[PDB]
Write a protein that binds this ligand. Sequence first.
Ligand SMILES: *[C@@H]1O[C@H](CO)[C@@H](O[C@@H]2O[C@H](CO)[C@@H](O)[C@H](O)[C@H]2NC(C)=O)[C@H](O)[C@H]1NC(C)=O
Length: 383
Amino acid sequence: GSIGAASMEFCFDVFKELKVHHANENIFYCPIAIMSALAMVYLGAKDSTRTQINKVVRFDKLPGFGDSIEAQCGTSVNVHSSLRDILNQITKPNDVYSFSLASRLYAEERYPILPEYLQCVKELYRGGLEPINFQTAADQARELINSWVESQTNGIIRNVLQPXSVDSQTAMVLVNAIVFKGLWEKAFKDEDTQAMPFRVTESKPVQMMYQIGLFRVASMASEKMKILELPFAXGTMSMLVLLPDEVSGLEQLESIINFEKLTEWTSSNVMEERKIKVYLPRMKMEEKYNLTSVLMAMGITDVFSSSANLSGISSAEXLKISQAVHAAHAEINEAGREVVGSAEAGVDAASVSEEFRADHPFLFCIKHIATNAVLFFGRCVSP
Ligand SMILES: *[C@@H]1O[C@H](CO)[C@@H](O[C@@H]2O[C@H](CO)[C@@H](O)[C@H](O)[C@H]2NC(C)=O)[C@H](O)[C@H]1NC(C)=O
């Protein structure tokens, strides 16, 4: 009924599926971006193709989604508003963070695109739809696609489509890549970062940032875990770090978490501002997933098969999504707007005893504060 609710439910559904084939590895994706890519496809899907997407991504009760409203694509700044409003806001230039989104549908050129659709994507989406020749120059097409994604992500997301992933039979490809970097409200000082061991299960040294400051923390003895909120500068986004008490307690947490639990654990009465010592590793997160495998296991299957019904995009028989890929990159480091002086810090050094030390596997979420929507979610087992 709200983007906050829908993005979190969708996020945890995706998490449940990635857990299957990604045990003991880092996991990192952008739920909001995946929903936007699927919303774009949803615009031209019909029959069961459309129903499966709506059911799995839950566009159902969302503002801007639904029968009458969507029929107005091309005009009306209301279509898919609940999603577009967040993406439109976070992709704008600003002085505290950078969020680059490269999302696009590449369709074989031989497929005549329905003109009402082009207008549709043209007005609601940037990347949109782009014609291309897979038929006789597949390796050439793959180069074109990967070079667009690379160029659009500051040279960060490279070779998104693997060789042999595209051939003379490819109908349409969905690429959805995102890069995020944000400044903390409260910076960590470079001089305070030290090599510290991270107990992966055994351990390895990692660059561990450190600072003492006032932060919202939730302590849940009942679940043997703590949650720390670190605000990004600007007051529009924050990062939640869910840290189990024991080095090997992640599995339990991952089994119990969902939208309801996350909401309860972070409510204003459970969260409390406390002077605390924070240890957080510098992290360079980057993962890429085959969305076809993920979404199919989640319940979206027709759109990827000859039985797909995208008669809203074209009229040609056989238009289906032949490959769909998601890649997300984000660096977590010291950069911030303000810092405590060496004098106050000195006083805290031996007076503050409470600490939040993320030196073992944890879960983390970057959220949009106003909507409560999930922008990124991940599991960090190796910083
Ligand atoms: C991604 O996962 C899918 C399903 O597990 C793999 O299967 C492909 O499915 C697409 C439909 O979107 C077909 O067009 C391909 O011909 C299928 N390829 C095969 C033989 O598996 C798909 O291969 C995976 N993508 C890659 C290259 O990793």
